[PDB]
Amino acid sequence: RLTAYERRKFRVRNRIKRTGRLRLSVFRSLKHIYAQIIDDEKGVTLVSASSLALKLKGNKTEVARQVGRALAEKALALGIKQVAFDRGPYKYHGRVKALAEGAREGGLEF
Amino acid sequence: ASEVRIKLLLECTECKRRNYATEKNKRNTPNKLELRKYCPWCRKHTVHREVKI
Amino acid sequence: PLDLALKRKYYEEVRPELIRRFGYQNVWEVPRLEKVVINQGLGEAKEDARILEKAAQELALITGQKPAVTRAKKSISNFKLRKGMPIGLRVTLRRDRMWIFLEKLLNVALPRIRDFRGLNPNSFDGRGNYNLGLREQLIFPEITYDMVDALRGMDIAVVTTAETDEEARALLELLGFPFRK
Amino acid sequence: AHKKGLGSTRNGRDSQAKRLGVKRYEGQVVRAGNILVRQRGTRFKPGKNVGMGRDFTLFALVDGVVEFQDRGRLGRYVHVRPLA
Amino acid sequence: MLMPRRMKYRKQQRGRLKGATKGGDYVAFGDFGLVALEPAWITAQQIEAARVAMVRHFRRGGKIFIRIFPDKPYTKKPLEVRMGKGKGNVEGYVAVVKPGRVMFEVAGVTEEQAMEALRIAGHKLPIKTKIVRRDAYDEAQ
RNA sequence: GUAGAGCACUGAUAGGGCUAGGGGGCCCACCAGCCUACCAAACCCUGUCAAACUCCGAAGGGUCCCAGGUGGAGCCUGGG
RNA sequence: GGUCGCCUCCUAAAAGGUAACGGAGGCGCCCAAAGGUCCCCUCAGGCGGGACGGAAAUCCGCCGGAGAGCGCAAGGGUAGAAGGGGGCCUGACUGCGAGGCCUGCAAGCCGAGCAGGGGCGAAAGCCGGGCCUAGUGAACCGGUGGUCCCGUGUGGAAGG
RNA sequence: UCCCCCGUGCCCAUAGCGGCGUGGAACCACCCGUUCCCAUUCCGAACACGGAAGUGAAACGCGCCAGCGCCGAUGGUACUGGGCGGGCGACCGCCUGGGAGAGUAGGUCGGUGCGGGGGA
RNA sequence: CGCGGGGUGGAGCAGCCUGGUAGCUCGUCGGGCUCAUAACCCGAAGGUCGUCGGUUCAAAUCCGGCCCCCGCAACCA
RNA sequence: CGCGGGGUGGAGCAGCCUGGUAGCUCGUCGGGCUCAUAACCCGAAGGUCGUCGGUUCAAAUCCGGCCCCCGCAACCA
Ligand SMILES: CN(CC[C@H](N)CC(=O)N[C@H]1C=C[C@H](n2ccc(N)nc2=O)O[C@@H]1C(=O)O)C(=N)N
Ligand SMILES: [Mg+2]
Ligand SMILES: [Mg+2]
Ligand SMILES: [Mg+2]
Ligand SMILES: [Mg+2]
Ligand SMILES: [Mg+2]
Ligand SMILES: [Mg+2]
Ligand SMILES: [Mg+2]
Ligand SMILES: [Mg+2]
Ligand SMILES: [Mg+2]
Ligand SMILES: [Mg+2]
Ligand SMILES: [Mg+2]
Ligand SMILES: [Mg+2]
Ligand SMILES: [Mg+2]
Ligand SMILES: [Mg+2]
Ligand SMILES: [Mg+2]
Ligand SMILES: [Mg+2]
Ligand SMILES: [Mg+2]
Ligand SMILES: [Mg+2]
Ligand SMILES: [Mg+2]
Ligand SMILES: [Mg+2]
Ligand SMILES: [Mg+2]
Ligand SMILES: [Mg+2]
Ligand SMILES: [Mg+2]
Ligand SMILES: [Mg+2]
Ligand SMILES: [Mg+2]
Ligand SMILES: [Mg+2]
Ligand SMILES: [Mg+2]
Ligand SMILES: [Mg+2]
Ligand SMILES: [Mg+2]
Ligand SMILES: [Mg+2]
Ligand SMILES: [Mg+2]
Ligand SMILES: [Mg+2]
Ligand SMILES: [Mg+2]
Ligand SMILES: [Mg+2]
Ligand SMILES: [Mg+2]
Ligand SMILES: [Mg+2]
Ligand SMILES: [Mg+2]
Ligand SMILES: [Mg+2]
Ligand SMILES: [Mg+2]
Ligand SMILES: [Mg+2]
Ligand SMILES: [Mg+2]
Ligand SMILES: [Mg+2]
Ligand SMILES: [Mg+2]
Ligand SMILES: [Mg+2]
Ligand SMILES: [Mg+2]
Ligand SMILES: [Mg+2]
Ligand SMILES: [Mg+2]
Ligand SMILES: [Mg+2]
Ligand SMILES: [Mg+2]
Ligand SMILES: [Mg+2]
Ligand SMILES: [Mg+2]
Ligand SMILES: [Mg+2]
Ligand SMILES: [Mg+2]
Ligand SMILES: [Mg+2]
Numbered sequence A: 001r002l003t004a005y006e007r008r009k010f011r012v013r014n015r016i017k018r019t020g021r022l023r024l025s026v027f028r029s030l031k032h033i034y035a036q037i038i039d040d041e042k043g044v045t046l047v048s049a050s051s052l053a054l055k056l057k058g059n060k061t062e063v064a065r066q067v068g069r070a071l072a073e074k075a076l077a078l079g080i081k082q083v084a085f086d087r088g089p090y091k092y093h094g095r096v097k098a099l100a101e102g103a104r105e106g107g108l109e110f
Numbered sequence B: 001a002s003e004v005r006i007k008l009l010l011e012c013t014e015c016k017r018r019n020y021a022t023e024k025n026k027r028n029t030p031n032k033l034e035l036r037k038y039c040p041w042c043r044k045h046t047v048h049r050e051v052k053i
Numbered sequence C: 001p002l003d004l005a006l007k008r009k010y011y012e013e014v015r016p017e018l019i020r021r022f023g024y025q026n027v028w029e030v031p032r033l034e035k036v037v038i039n040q041g042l043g044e045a046k047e048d049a050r051i052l053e054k055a056a057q058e059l060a061l062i063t064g065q066k067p068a069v070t071r072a073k074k075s076i077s078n079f080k081l082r083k084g085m086p087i088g089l090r091v092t093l094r095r096d097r098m099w100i101f102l103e104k105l106l107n108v109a110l111p112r113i114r115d116f117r118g119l120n121p122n123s124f125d126g127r128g129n130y131n132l133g134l135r136e137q138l139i140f141p142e143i144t145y146d147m148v149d150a151l152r153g154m155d156i157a158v159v160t161t162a163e164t165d166e167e168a169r170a171l172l173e174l175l176g177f178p179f180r181k
Numbered sequence D: 001a002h003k004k005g006l007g008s009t010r011n012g013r014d015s016q017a018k019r020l021g022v023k024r025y026e027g028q029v030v031r032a033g034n035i036l037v038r039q040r041g042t043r044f045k046p047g048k049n050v051g052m053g054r055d056f057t058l059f060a061l062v063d064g065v066v067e068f069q070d071r072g073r074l075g076r077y078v079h080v081r082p083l084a
Numbered sequence E: 001m002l003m004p005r006r007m008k009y010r011k012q013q014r015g016r017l018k019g020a021t022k023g024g025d026y027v028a029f030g031d032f033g034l035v036a037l038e039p040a041w042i043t044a045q046q047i048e049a050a051r052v053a054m055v056r057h058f059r060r061g062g063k064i065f066i067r068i069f070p071d072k073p074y075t076k077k078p079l080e081v082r083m084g085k086g087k088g089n090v091e092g093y094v095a096v097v098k099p100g101r102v103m104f105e106v107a108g109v110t111e112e113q114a115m116e117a118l119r120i121a122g123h124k125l126p127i128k129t130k131i132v133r134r135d136a137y138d139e140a141q
Numbered sequence F: 001g002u003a004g005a006g007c008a009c010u011g012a013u014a015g016g017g018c019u020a021g022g023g024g025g026c027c028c029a030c031c032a033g034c035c036u037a038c039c040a041a042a043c044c045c046u047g048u049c050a051a052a053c054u055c056c057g058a059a060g061g062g063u064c065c066c067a068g069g070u071g072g073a074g075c076c077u078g079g080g
Numbered sequence G: 001g002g003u004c005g006c007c008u009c010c011u012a013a014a015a016g017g018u019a020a021c022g023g024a025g026g027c028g029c030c031c032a033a034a035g036g037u038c039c040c041c042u043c044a045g046g047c048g049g050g051a052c053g054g055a056a057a058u059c060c061g062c063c064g065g066a067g068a069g070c071g072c073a074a075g076g077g078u079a080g081a082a083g084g085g086g087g088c089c090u091g092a093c094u095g096c097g098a099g100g101c102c103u104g105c106a107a108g109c110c111g112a113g114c115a116g117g118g119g120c121g122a123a124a125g126c127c128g129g130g131c132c133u134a135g136u137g138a139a140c141c142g143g144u145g146g147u148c149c150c151g152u153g154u155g156g157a158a159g160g
Numbered sequence H: 001u002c003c004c005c006c007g008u009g010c011c012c013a014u015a016g017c018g019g020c021g022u023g024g025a026a027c028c029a030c031c032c033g034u035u036c037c038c039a040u041u042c043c044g045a046a047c048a049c050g051g052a053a054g055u056g057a058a059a060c061g062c063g064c065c066a067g068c069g070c071c072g073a074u075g076g077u078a079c080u081g082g083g084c085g086g087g088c089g090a091c092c093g094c095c096u097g098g099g100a101g102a103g104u105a106g107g108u109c110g111g112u113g114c115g116g117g118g119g120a
Numbered sequence I, J: 001c002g003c004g005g006g007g008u009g010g011a012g013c014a015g016c017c018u019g020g021u022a023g024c025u026c027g028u029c030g031g032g033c034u035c036a037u038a039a040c041c042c043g044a045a046g047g048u049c050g051u052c053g054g055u056u057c058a059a060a061u062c063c064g065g066c067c068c069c070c071g072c073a074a075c076c077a
């Protein structure tokens, strides 16, 4: 048996893992918010901005905004551009949402 | 496809000339099958409506 | 959101007499009320009564929430019913509309039922929590003879963290519920 | 001297041949477009560079050998692995 | 008579009878037993005549175990018809026995009272038969 | 997905266990208690059957790659 | 007497294919929602639980991987949806088609990708009708709407 | 490089069902609230958001057992590509190569790659 | 498909070429009578007059035709 | 067995086509009139629809196996 959460993961995840593009796997915690970049074809992570590593604070969605700006620069150094946003079981609204448009601030294409 | 299910062609209400080919049940929707579609003689989408085939 | 007379009743009076019996080794293992799902469960609104609304707005002005129309699981012959036909009135009183409702049942509405005589105590399921059925509706404080039109009993379901049937007994019994024996 | 009240069979009907099944095999060169498997419902699953048609047909998207993979409970897959 | 009390399909194919049985080649309920030496189909007609035979042997007493069931439709074309025009209508019901399969067992019966018993029931059968008693080889099986 | 083989599903199936309602006294129920050398659902253990059953599954057979193979071999285009 | 085209299954001997007046069934339709998308969700059933209320109306509980559902026959497939609900919608597009599946012919069938112009989506992407496999009819003769290509010396017209 | 943790891939249930335990400083979760964005055929259950008082009860995590499910040999056999003989037949035997299904002995309460965040 | 006509009370139809009344027997209730099933007889419920949109001063008789039954006709690769 | 039609209150018939929809006659039981019986007048009672599967939400109705009534055949050259 699987959870609404568990199904909804695969449902949108698989929609994307079969696009060939670098998948940017997010994670929404009630504490703070992070996201890595995975080339699932192998399985390796390309780069991994966060909020525990960057140890920031001051409103969840504004520190959701920031972490992406980290991702943008810190990934674009490794010539990364092909971006496919794994939005997880979470939607595209507020928290995870801001991370995206923040990841867009840098030059990341998605 | 039957008595009940009539055939119909889609008129372009910009020039009144025919355009497409499909069916529609004339029971549950006795109205006019009005749908946006494309035109080669216009190269733009427009309005379309059932003219009796 | 708020703070009321039964919500604090469950607070400083009920939590202790519960750690009395079962002596819970943790703050949370202790019982507490979660869901309260009222069910007029009509079917009296078959392929006819569009006036199922003037019976379900009464359900609103006695539960505070609009009730959601539960339809047909499938189509049924002898019941005179098609898959899709409205046959249910489910309102799930959750959080602080629950205490606002539950007290008004116990202190005002429960007694005004005709020939009250406890509460059927075997009706506890076992694997968890509890629920039991009505007879009418105007016994509820919000209405009387002219406001209520047709008569309509209703089902009412408690959903508590009562893992066990015994500890459920205590939770509700202490909370204000009169039982048969 | 012969026949009498001879029972007629209600059946004797039949379908066409569908000539389904697997058309290309592992370690077989293919080009882009080729059909790898005809089927009715993914007995075989669309791998990398393998697409799926409106009847569950499975066709190659790029060149180089086909390759079969069996992921147990997940499904049987076939992908094409590009040239060299 | 031993007919299937419900049926998935009407007529059913012939199928050859190559080789030994698939199970029940070792006694499992009764003390003694009757077995196939040669493969056949057995009619419900036959089976019932063997049962009735034994049943009449130890008149009043004994318990009979019978380990085969007529589950196959023995179809047959009516009298004087030519080939084709469909398959025969189902005329009987038969059960597929191969060599080794156990057919008749008995318990609550003397030694020879089950010898003579399972002897005659052998005679109401289209096939050569052996009678064998329950043994450790059966217990180990 | 075949021979085999196995009931895990689809159906058959013999017995026994256990158990609905039916059957039937005890009661004579206005109803409960029902007891069962009765019928027997699901359900269990033993024991089985199946082209249109499949938890399984050969020998093989297909098909590609690579190697032997010069054969009244193979291939392309045409006449009969 | 029965049959005649189509689809499913079996016969069919584990590739494809294979007959019989072999064994069993269906098709000659349907859907402006049953479609496209995006978001979301999860069965049958069984046990306990409860006014009317039931073996089965609806509400509550614990057990359920799939035995439900997927318009309708069957097989395969299938909840990590193909199934249930909602919002916007009309790609049930026009111009094509690398490459193949099948195949005596002719038909049948899959389709990446390119161009125009739109749909939904934040976007990655998805849409050239429906979970697929039936729902069908070659060519001739003519009808209707267009285009404005021929038009019997010639401009038109007639006809094509 | 060793360990715990989080986010994840992969073998395909030896992974799982269940019962027994332990983990909160960290990280994860429940938990606090409806003001804001967002949100329910009713309900902040869920999705959302602002939080950090409580906690490890639930879930999840690491683990323990083998009751279930699961995987599961060796040996022998059925069957069979090929080559022979045998019976009126239904069918049976030998050679050579291949060789199961059940069942038996036993195994199993997972195994790991990438990055990150702690421990030394 | 194209020419012909209407689709009237619950079941039939005269209103109708020339608009004016929200129409008559059968059927149905109650009633005098009958010995009765009956004819007779006095009162009755029934039109959104197929609909939609009109023509006016309103329409059910005059129209655009929606509609889809009866009628005739001709064609069918 | 081959085709065709049939099976519904006690008797005989509708009802199936287009499913949810059980009517006509007789008779039968209760009551009236009558000295009484019929007649006639007033009321009511009475079929899970051959039989079984099954389709559907659901079957007199649709479908298929079997039992039965009836109708033509089973050509024997
Ligand atoms: C009775 N006749 C005879 C016609 C022929 N020329 C002669 C004759 O006897 N023909 C017959 C020949 C045999 C034929 N028959 C019978 C049985 C059968 N199974 N197959 C046949 O062909 O049926 C025919 C028949 O009687 O008409 C005429 N009225 N003409
Ligand atoms: Mg205690
Ligand atoms: Mg009382
Ligand atoms: Mg002769
Ligand atoms: Mg076939
Ligand atoms: Mg039995
Ligand atoms: Mg039994
Ligand atoms: Mg018995
Ligand atoms: Mg008992
Ligand atoms: Mg088989
Ligand atoms: Mg195995
Ligand atoms: Mg093997
Ligand atoms: Mg040569
Ligand atoms: Mg040439
Ligand atoms: Mg040449
Ligand atoms: Mg040439
Ligand atoms: Mg003929
Ligand atoms: Mg081929
Ligand atoms: Mg042929
Ligand atoms: Mg049960
Ligand atoms: Mg119950
Ligand atoms: Mg109840
Ligand atoms: Mg009850
Ligand atoms: Mg119930
Ligand atoms: Mg279906
Ligand atoms: Mg099959
Ligand atoms: Mg199946
Ligand atoms: Mg959906
Ligand atoms: Mg919907
Ligand atoms: Mg939007
Ligand atoms: Mg092509
Ligand atoms: Mg081509
Ligand atoms: Mg494309
Ligand atoms: Mg686009
Ligand atoms: Mg289809
Ligand atoms: Mg013209
Ligand atoms: Mg010109
Ligand atoms: Mg001029
Ligand atoms: Mg022209
Ligand atoms: Mg993870
Ligand atoms: Mg604990
Ligand atoms: Mg603390
Ligand atoms: Mg605990
Ligand atoms: Mg767990
Ligand atoms: Mg660890
Ligand atoms: Mg570890
Ligand atoms: Mg360790
Ligand atoms: Mg370990
Ligand atoms: Mg141990
Ligand atoms: Mg062990
Ligand atoms: Mg052990
Ligand atoms: Mg094993
Ligand atoms: Mg040979
Ligand atoms: Mg031989
Ligand atoms: Mg071996």
Ligand SMILES: [Mg+2]
Pocket: none
């Ligand atoms: Mg051998």
Ligand SMILES: [Mg+2]
Pocket: none
């Ligand atoms: Mg470290």
Ligand SMILES: [Mg+2]
Pocket: none
């Ligand atoms: Mg340090």
Ligand SMILES: [Mg+2]
Pocket: I005, I071
């Ligand atoms: Mg006329």
Ligand SMILES: [Mg+2]
Pocket: I019
């Ligand atoms: Mg006038």
Ligand SMILES: [Mg+2]
Pocket: none
């Ligand atoms: Mg008188």
Ligand SMILES: [Mg+2]
Pocket: none
């Ligand atoms: Mg004529």
Ligand SMILES: [Mg+2]
Pocket: I076
């Ligand atoms: Mg015509």
Ligand SMILES: [Mg+2]
Pocket: none
């Ligand atoms: Mg008939």
Ligand SMILES: [Mg+2]
Pocket: none
């Ligand atoms: Mg009769």
Ligand SMILES: [Mg+2]
Pocket: J014, J024
């Ligand atoms: Mg009549």
Ligand SMILES: [Mg+2]
Pocket: none
């Ligand atoms: Mg019939």
Ligand SMILES: [Mg+2]
Pocket: J021, J060
């Ligand atoms: Mg009826």
Ligand SMILES: [Mg+2]
Pocket: none
């Ligand atoms: Mg009278």
Ligand SMILES: [Mg+2]
Pocket: none
């Ligand atoms: Mg019938």
Ligand SMILES: [Mg+2]
Pocket: J073
């Ligand atoms: Mg005759």
